[PDB]
Subunit: 387 residues, 4 copies
Amino acid sequence: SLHPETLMVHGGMKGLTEAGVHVPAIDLSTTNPVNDVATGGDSYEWLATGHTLKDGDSAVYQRLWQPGVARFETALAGLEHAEEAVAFATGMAAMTAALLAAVSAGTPHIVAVRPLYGGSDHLLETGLLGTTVTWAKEADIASAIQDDTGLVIVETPANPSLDLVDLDSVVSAAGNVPVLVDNTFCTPVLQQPISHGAALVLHSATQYLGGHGDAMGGIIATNADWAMRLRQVRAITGALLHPMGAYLLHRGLRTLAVRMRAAQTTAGELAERLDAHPAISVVHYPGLKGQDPRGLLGRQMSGGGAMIAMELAGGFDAARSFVEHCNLVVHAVSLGGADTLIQHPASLTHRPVAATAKPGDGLIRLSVGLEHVDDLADDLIAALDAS
Amino acid sequence: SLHPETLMVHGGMKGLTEAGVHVPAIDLSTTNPVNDVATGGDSYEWLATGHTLKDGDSAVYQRLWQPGVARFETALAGLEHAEEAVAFATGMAAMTAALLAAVSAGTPHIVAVRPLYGGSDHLLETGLLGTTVTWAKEADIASAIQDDTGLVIVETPANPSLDLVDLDSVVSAAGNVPVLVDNTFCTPVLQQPISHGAALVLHSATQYLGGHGDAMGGIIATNADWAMRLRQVRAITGALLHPMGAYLLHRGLRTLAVRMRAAQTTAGELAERLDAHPAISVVHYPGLKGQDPRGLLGRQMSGGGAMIAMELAGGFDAARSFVEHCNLVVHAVSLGGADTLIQHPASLTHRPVAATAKPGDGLIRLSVGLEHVDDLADDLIAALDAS
Amino acid sequence: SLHPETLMVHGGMKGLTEAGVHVPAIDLSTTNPVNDVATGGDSYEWLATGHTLKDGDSAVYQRLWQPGVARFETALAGLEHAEEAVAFATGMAAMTAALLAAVSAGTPHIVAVRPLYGGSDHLLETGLLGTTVTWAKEADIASAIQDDTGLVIVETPANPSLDLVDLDSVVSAAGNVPVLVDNTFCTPVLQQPISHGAALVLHSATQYLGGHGDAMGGIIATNADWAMRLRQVRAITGALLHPMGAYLLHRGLRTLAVRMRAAQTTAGELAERLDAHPAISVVHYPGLKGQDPRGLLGRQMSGGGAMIAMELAGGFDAARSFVEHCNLVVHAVSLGGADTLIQHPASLTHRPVAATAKPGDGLIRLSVGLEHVDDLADDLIAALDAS
Amino acid sequence: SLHPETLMVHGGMKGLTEAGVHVPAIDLSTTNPVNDVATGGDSYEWLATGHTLKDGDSAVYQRLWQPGVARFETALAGLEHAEEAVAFATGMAAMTAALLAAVSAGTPHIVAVRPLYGGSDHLLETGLLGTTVTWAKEADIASAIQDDTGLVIVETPANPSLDLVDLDSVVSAAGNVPVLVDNTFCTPVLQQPISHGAALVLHSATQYLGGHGDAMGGIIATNADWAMRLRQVRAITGALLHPMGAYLLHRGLRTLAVRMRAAQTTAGELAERLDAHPAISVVHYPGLKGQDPRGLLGRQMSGGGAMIAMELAGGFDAARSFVEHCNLVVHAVSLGGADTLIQHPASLTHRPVAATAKPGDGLIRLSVGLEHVDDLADDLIAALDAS
Ligand SMILES: C/C=C(/N=C/c1c(COP(=O)(O)O)cnc(C)c1O)C(=O)O
Ligand SMILES: C/C=C(/N=C/c1c(COP(=O)(O)O)cnc(C)c1O)C(=O)O
Ligand SMILES: C/C=C(/N=C/c1c(COP(=O)(O)O)cnc(C)c1O)C(=O)O
Ligand SMILES: C/C=C(/N=C/c1c(COP(=O)(O)O)cnc(C)c1O)C(=O)O
């Protein structure tokens, strides 16, 4: 019954007002005492087998359950409209757990759609976790699926070029196979993959959910079956989210709508000014005219986002000079933060990607922050004029 | 040239006094800016391929390098007398990385000697990470080794029964295969597996290294080849140790010698009093008479430790009543903390272990803390007399 | 040359990008080593006598200087356009330091204009710190000033009724006496009291500057003379802001403009809906028509704010029932947070105030958060209809 | 019924085991919601008037009550055997509150015995808080007392020269006037001033109670009357201890007996080696022969302590050469940490002290840590031999 702006502030804050406290406490306890051998043992088995902690039951150990992490999990699950959510140390740890869950189930094959984040792409290419990958285009998903396929890894807008994918078509092509959508760039503010029929939704909480570049994290909003499988892997592989990391990511969700709306407004205006510059040939931004032929803005995405990628006319040398002459905009990886960042994907985020699949050498990715539009445009224009 | 007691206080504190600060700072930065595309890209590749951060180089991203974690890593490596060390979110994440490093190298077979911690035992039994295991006795290690073997996993004193293993004999039997010794129970204060020829030394930093039951962690002190392999896995799977977790584990190392020496003294006295009680049939404690036939105390272990396991005369019912009637001693999992804890291993820590390999039903594990010996004995005796 | 929205993100972040880090580190060091007796001693004297730490000098001790606190201090001083700023544990500690500085200078008399926060009002009334106070109206400031006066204390919008004060007129009436302006409610986003000629500007950083209800703090943006006096008191009375408290308050400044602008928009709309309700007789909100006769909105305040006070028609019983029937809006003290709070000032914030000076029994104060306007209005209307 | 070693581990940990948690949680909440206007208002008045929070009552606001601070308060009060305890940001904030409590009661005069820490000394000399002072010798306390006297401030061993004071004689001479004893150097492990009849016992929790040089703090263990007065001052002046500061000082109490016993053993041996060196003329350490004529060791102090001061034969030049040539031992202020520190008191800790009352120019103070005795002696001897 409440709007998403209200649910970002009060999500995962259940029972705190009733207990006479304002924010969730940070419990650093590694162990959690048990009342007796029978209840302690049953709670251990329930949690180790991937189940949610029962109300009025001991967490037993942090690798089995953490209350602060659990609050962050229920907060994001409510925003994505998923049954449950499982949080890990990083976005890669969440990807690792989802791949190990599929391998453990007897479905090691993965049908993935490029572009994807460099690490997600490299982890599937190497097959470190016993996975086999089949790189397929959006239209050729149904054909690429084998009896051995466990998941369909997709991402929209893609990292770095912001390639869009119709989630309704992907779910239709996947059939009985579950679809994993990496909704890091859009966030639950702009896109809700669960509504389109995605089984699991991955987020690199490090970006946008944290929002201040000071909390690493990874989280998958999904149904109870996949949450149980992810928790089974988490309890034995232990890629845990620290109680303070969970606190800051949950804290960041309270300002996610106001931060996304402010950065999106700045980005929509910057993409127009940057397209007009002669040094830039192509500007990739969903909110621009022509960039949305399938009509996914409105239907799937309630906004253009705060990420802008661009192809330089002078190729690699112009792209290199552009990031090196930025002063206010900082040359660094990561996104969704309070400050504006810029980077060459082929040299940093997508460096472990295969040569054939690497992004363009003239391409530059930018994360728009909460600074004034004029000060960011002045700095980016001066950097382009330096070449 | 310095004693281990001095190195626990000043280890990993290099350059802090020279910078005008007392303790290492907690840098929560997820990203780390780069000077240019060339140096940033080269630093990314150097770190992603498992190398140590060069002095005067950007960390690029937290999943590649964290300075607070690095200080903890160098502090423990110096205590174990290893070349380097790699830290993770939990002890299970460190085990996971070591197993994935062996599988990635083309050696998925592991030769492990029981007893081991329930999770370490279950992770090998299930073969979640693409590993095959051959459970062998200490004397039958050489015969159990195949051309496909990547590691020899041992633990001494074993969790929970405190079974001792001659590390010189295990290294001799392994030959060309590297040996991984879990030194969680002994700590670098009491045992140095690197000196016996172990290639890698695992520690659940959650216990003893942290010492206050408020910091989860895992760390492997090893040579440069295995450290590079572990960091390659850590960079892509991301089971990272949070900057505050690293701060508290590093902080805990400063008091590790004084905490271990105090708890060991209390444990040596408790094991004698508990052996004299009629309710207890067997008291497993290395420092006790008859428990050390091979003369490993002095030679391998400088002391008896602060862990005591015991077999109850009345079986499961006496073991159950003993932990349920403890008041000062708390019924909970985990060890090496400031407080004394007690638990039934077959019901909790070793619950995911196979029925044939599970510990005795009358066995009880106890972690001795920093409380007065008389107050702990009074509580444990009253709990035994309650049945 | 930069806009205030840009300066909130990058303020106090000097040298971090150049050092290869994203956010300021949290240095918990209580002590700071010295190079020699001469430089250490001179740095001790320089800091103990209220001076700023020199570049390339030891902080010596945390009670003399803390670097994380110093970054927060320079960030807010730039936002208020003050020379320097001094931070303390709470807003009351900052008030205490300012009153102690005036008493130490030989000017214990204070001219204060009501309404003020309950604690600020009570601390002056009791004269705990050796002060004498003369409660004067805005027009009668010049007459109330004595040769013994050290400060003129004003607050606009006042806590709780939001009474406005013309700062240009107050500065003119004070003359040689410095004016302290508590700018907690307006924040540097909406008011620049230093521009009007205020010597010192006080903020309860706990509210708005922190913004998430999880960091207590107090800070005074002022000239070098008063900053020196405040630091001299801080070094000997030690009401220090903890390094983590400074980190979160500095972190909160990065989203201050987007949080204030979102809550102000919601408040301007709520004040019109609440004025139309029959249960409420008077709604105090500067943005509302008729509430600004002196035209201070535009000239002094660049916005109406996110605080709304109101007088119930049914007196105390209606005011009591209104806060007790709120569900989404929480009955609690404090303001400027991500969530909407409500409280009866005469019973809580202004309870230590003298009976004659206490606010109206039918008056209720409300802090507007970042929730959707419809969900907040629905809850507040239902609470009024419950009576 | 329990020993002090047991009470240091389990003190202030009441109800945690019963709630299924290991360590106390860190609640950063600035505000605490109230059930209704009547209970909220009554809880506000009860806390603002200096009373302890009732069980099952809202804390209302952090400046009135904090639960993590409260657990640290009850933990130390039990160790000192006091009724209650009040914690502040620093040791100077606690001194400030006690002095303001005496001034507020109508007893501004103080009878203080030197030597005292430079800050305590200077705060009394300046009379910043409206406090008159009469510097008296231990034997002349009774004569120095006026009808206006509110407190008798003493410290043993004194900072820096370790001068001992007979607490039984001081209490007898004070009579009706309460005695404040600064027990920072001895800690509740070695001295219990409450047993000798002291009304209030101050500690600079920054030293020894924290023990790792990363948590500033101040605390006074006292009867209910003085605790109420101290809390009345704390609620209005707000020199609060941050929830994380409270957590680390409480955490530090768990290892206080093992840290004190280890550093005391190292110090007793170092004082003997340093006395034998020709460069040092006098070694002030209570345990050494002749340094305790009144027999206070055993009767009042159960140990010599971990602080050593000494007079150099070459005067100031030898004293400055000694601290400047130390490498392992660090030249810095503060004490009771895991590492060994050294400093010239007249130039640093006691620099704001009057020239007549300042310590000797050849005097050097040293805080002994948890490093090996041989490594500390080797470094200190080499530093003396450098001159
Ligand atoms: C270097 C960081 C960047 N990204 C990461 C990322 C991850 C992986 O998330 P952790 O980094 O493991 O929390 C997953 N999915 C997406 C769409 C991502 O952007 C970056 O692009 O700049
Ligand atoms: C429940 C925890 C206990 N142990 C853990 C542990 C680990 C694994 O370490 P993390 O628990 O993942 O940090 C590895 N190796 C050993 C010998 C261990 O004791 C326990 O038994 O009490
Ligand atoms: C209970 C807290 C509230 N405010 C306090 C406050 C302070 C004092 O700020 P510390 O509370 O000392 O940080 C100073 N100045 C103003 C205008 C304030 O509103 C409140 O009213 O809800
Ligand atoms: C510079 C610091 C030192 N001392 C402090 C101190 C305090 C004052 O407490 P905070 O320092 O404010 O926590 C109170 N009481 C005693 C006996 C102290 O030694 C020091 O001596 O090295």
